[PDB]
Amino acid sequence: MVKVIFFDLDDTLVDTSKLAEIARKNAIENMIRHGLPVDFETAYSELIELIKEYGSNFPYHFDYLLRRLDLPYNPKWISAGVIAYHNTKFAYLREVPGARKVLIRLKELGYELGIITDGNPVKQWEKILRLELDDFFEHVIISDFEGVKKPHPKIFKKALKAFNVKPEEALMVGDRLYSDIYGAKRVGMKTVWFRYGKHSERELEYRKYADYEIDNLESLLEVLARESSSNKKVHPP
Amino acid sequence: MVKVIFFDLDDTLVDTSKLAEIARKNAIENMIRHGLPVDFETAYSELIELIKEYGSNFPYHFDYLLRRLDLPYNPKWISAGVIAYHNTKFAYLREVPGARKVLIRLKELGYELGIITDGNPVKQWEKILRLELDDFFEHVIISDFEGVKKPHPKIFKKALKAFNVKPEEALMVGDRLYSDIYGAKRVGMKTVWFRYGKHSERELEYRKYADYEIDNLESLLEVLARESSSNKKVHPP
Known part of the structure; x- marks a missing residue:
């Protein structure tokens, strides 16, 4: 009964999982829009590998992505990623x-x-x-x-x-x-x-x-x- | 060449790994010495399960162990665990x-x-x-x-x-x-x-x-x- x-x-x-995926893709796309000198396919693939190596809740994925790509710390690129990630979560939560x-x-x-x-x-x-x-x-x-x-x-x-x-x-x-x-x-x-x-x-x-x-x-x-x-x-x- | x-x-x-193991055992033993109303075998087994469920670097293992054992938050017991854990690391690093x-x-x-x-x-x-x-x-x-x-x-x-x-x-x-x-x-x-x-x-x-x-x-x-x-x-x- x-x-x-x-x-x-x-x-x-x-x-949740689908939203997270789109947020991550948008983060990379926004970093590129603001200057990240790497193509989407490459940058996104490295982000995924970085996530599997450092964990889903690691607080510095974007900072470490720059390290991984041998790029100097750039707060503009990092903030661009954070902005897009949060914007996605805010707009598409469903x-x-x-x-x-x-x-x-x-x-x-x-x-x-x-x-x-x-x-x-x-x-x-x-x-x-x-x-x-x-x-x-x-x-x-x-x-x-x-x-x-x-x-x-x-x-x-x-x-x-x-x-x-x-x-x-x-x-x-x-x-x-x-x-x-x-x-x-x-x-x-x-x-x-x-x-x-x-x-x-x-x-x-x-x-x-x-x-x-x-x-x-x-x-x-x-x-x-x-x-x-x-x-x-x-x-x- | x-x-x-x-x-x-x-x-x-x-x-490192052996030191961590001894530090965890000592943490539980010290909590018990200070009042934790649970036997070592039980408390330590739950700690290990808690670590496998929440991760090795989770910052609140001892707080969550109390939750898991249905015991009210007790800063005395938690501090006892932290003290023994740190004391072990300090004394036995080798x-x-x-x-x-x-x-x-x-x-x-x-x-x-x-x-x-x-x-x-x-x-x-x-x-x-x-x-x-x-x-x-x-x-x-x-x-x-x-x-x-x-x-x-x-x-x-x-x-x-x-x-x-x-x-x-x-x-x-x-x-x-x-x-x-x-x-x-x-x-x-x-x-x-x-x-x-x-x-x-x-x-x-x-x-x-x-x-x-x-x-x-x-x-x-x-x-x-x-x-x-x-x-x-x-x-x-």
């Missing part, structure tokens, strides 16, 4: 196609909704408030408050307790088979894998933990309607 | 066994020595100065200045240029088959893999790039003496 539907935030409700329409319909149907995500609480809430997703959700469960990262069972159990619902009365929708799907199924929740983006072979080994698979968020409505034989019921282990 | 010998810093000349004796002998024999490493320049130099390794090396090549990470060829080529030596006139000694060995061999240097610590199957696929393998730093002297048929010579591609 599904009463609560939980969603991951990034790449399920919000188009929901994954169909997300809002689906949320509105779920509320119209009477489901209670929640979010289960990882990351800095303020940053995650910024996405929620900027996209006006706030009153769609009764609770926003963030793993960092609990000192764990999904798929750790602690955060999923906390989500269930917040809504005071049994595992089988909850359904998790997420794009990541390991962190979202396996995590929710391990504690007894129903699961819907949103096949969005690319997945590694290791991640795909967790595909069995998904009760349903959808390529479009709209299809979630079909799944829930089908779940009209209830979930399974009381019974056993 | 080996004229220059290059060394990686961490886990080749300096016992060379990998045999490193200094080998460096002294290499200088006595007439080799020019250099370091090729990754990381924040100031932090790497702190290890060098604290262990009084300074005048053993003519040049300390740090990848971050070049905006790349080993095994990128750029940093190895820079090292060769600094010493104005041909690739075959240089030999690289390092514990990592991918970042140290493959990196040096790719540009033409002679290589000695120091089998220290654990190595993954993927790393082991680069074992062919090592000309020699040693389990003790002292054995490097034997390798160099053997290299008494020169390296190979002028010749071809």
Whole structure:
């Protein structure tokens, strides 16, 4: 008996990865527009390699890109990249196609909704408030408050307790088979894998933990309607 | 004709990983000594999991450990961990066994020595100065200045240029088959893999790039003496 539907935030409700990609491309293009003496293909390829070598959250990608290209520190070029990166984030932040329409319909149907995500609480809430997703959700469960990262069972159990619902009365929708799907199924929740983006072979080994698979968020409505034989019921282990 | 010998810093000349392990264990033990209501085995296991979930350089491991254990923020326990962690680093920073004796002998024999490493320049130099390794090396090549990470060829080529030596006139000694060995061999240097610590199957696929393998730093002297048929010579591609 599904009463609560939980969603991951990034790449399920919000188009985070795609936005990041476009922001990075625009950053390089703006650096070039302002003088960076390198072609886009070369500069962007090096940025990607730099990101894989130094990490996604390294604070000096643009400064190090200049070092990598044997160019002297140039605050003009670096600022050009930062400006374009931020401008992109400000202008294109958006929901994954169909997300809002689906949320509105779920509320119209009477489901209670929640979010289960990882990351800095303020940053995650910024996405929620900027996209006006706030009153769609009764609770926003963030793993960092609990000192764990999904798929750790602690955060999923906390989500269930917040809504005071049994595992089988909850359904998790997420794009990541390991962190979202396996995590929710391990504690007894129903699961819907949103096949969005690319997945590694290791991640795909967790595909069995998904009760349903959808390529479009709209299809979630079909799944829930089908779940009209209830979930399974009381019974056993 | 080996004229220059290059060394990686961490886990080749300096016992970095082992020191970090002991520092982490001591941090947990000190937290417990000051009240942390958890047994060492449990607390340390969670710390390790926390490190794998949040990263080696996350600045709030101890704060998040409390969150993970459902304990209220306690600055006393956190400070106890920080104190023990730093005390350990201060008291036990040391060379990998045999490193200094080998460096002294290499200088006595007439080799020019250099370091090729990754990381924040100031932090790497702190290890060098604290262990009084300074005048053993003519040049300390740090990848971050070049905006790349080993095994990128750029940093190895820079090292060769600094010493104005041909690739075959240089030999690289390092514990990592991918970042140290493959990196040096790719540009033409002679290589000695120091089998220290654990190595993954993927790393082991680069074992062919090592000309020699040693389990003790002292054995490097034997390798160099053997290299008494020169390296190979002028010749071809």
